[PDB]
Design a protein around this ligand. Structure first.
Ligand SMILES: [Mg+2]
Length: 208
DNA sequence: CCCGGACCTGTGACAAATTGCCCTCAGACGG
DNA sequence: CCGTCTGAGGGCAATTTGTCACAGGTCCGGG
């Protein structure tokens, strides 16, 4: 299946995208990399990749696309994703205008096969699997320590998850569970503390 | 000695949002 | 021209995600 690659600067960038928008984003990166910034999406091709009907595909593309307006990307400098609205010349076909200034940030890199992520539902969990891959070894294992405040900024978790028990229950446990249930990776963790405060989360993983 | 207060934890409610489903009906194409 | 495959619309209830009040732990410094 298609092998996604992206600069680590994008993996660690700050942004908020839905699953459907992130799903579309993978195809843009695939299209762009296999070469001005003008990409295209066919309804019927999208449907076959993610096992959806044409109708629900159409609904997902259409609503994702109009929700891009005003979205911005921060590299620690802010940029908009799109500089022109989407439009359909033909039935079943969409044409999109990615900000050409994003190109160099697209192409010290991260890689994963698309089948690894296409069953994930929660977008924050898609971002965690993208951030673990950045440190993965050939054989398929790795271990990395991420700071909680940096997790909150980079993934832009909503504000009420600054209370740690809500963070645990509605983000961490759920996203660890899906990965273990929906990917070929087996993930565990432990909490790092300083006094009463939890400061980092330590992830360990292996393949198969 | 024990207090109220500033911290920490997990859970129960409810509100807002998202999931995969369903139904209708005209466009684009080829038989 | 019509019968069929698409896909652009309109909806639903069942789940997930996002928010906050309240009980219950600790340690500190004042009474
Ligand atoms: Mg959907």
């Amino acid at each position: 299946s298609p092998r996604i690659v992206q600069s680590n600067d994008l993996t660690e960038a700050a942004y908020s995208l839905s699953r459907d928008q992130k799903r579309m984003l993978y195809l843009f990166v695939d299209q762009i990399r296999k070469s001005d910034g003008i990409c295209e999406i066919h309804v019927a091709k999208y449907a076959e990749i993610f096992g959806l009907t044409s109708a629900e595909a159409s609904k997902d593309i259409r609503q994702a696309l109009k929700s891009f307006a005003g979205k911005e990307v921060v590299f620690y400098e802010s940029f908009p994703w799109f500089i022109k609205p989407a439009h359909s010349p033909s039935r079943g076909l969409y044409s999109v205008h990615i900000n050409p200034y994003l190109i160099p940030f697209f192409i010290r890199f991260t890689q994963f096969r698309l089948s690894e992520t296409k069953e994930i539902t929660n977008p924050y969990a898609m971002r965690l699997y993208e951030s673990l891959c950045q440190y993965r070894k050939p054989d398929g294992s790795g271990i990395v320590s991420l700071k909680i405040d940096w997790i909150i900024e980079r993934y832009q978790l909503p504000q009420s998850y600054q209370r740690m028990p809500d963070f645990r229950r509605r983000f961490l446990q759920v996203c660890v569970n899906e990965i273990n249930s929906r990917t070929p990776m087996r993930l565990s963790y432990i909490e790092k503390k300083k006094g009463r405060q939890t400061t980092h989360i330590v992830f360990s993983f292996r393949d198969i």
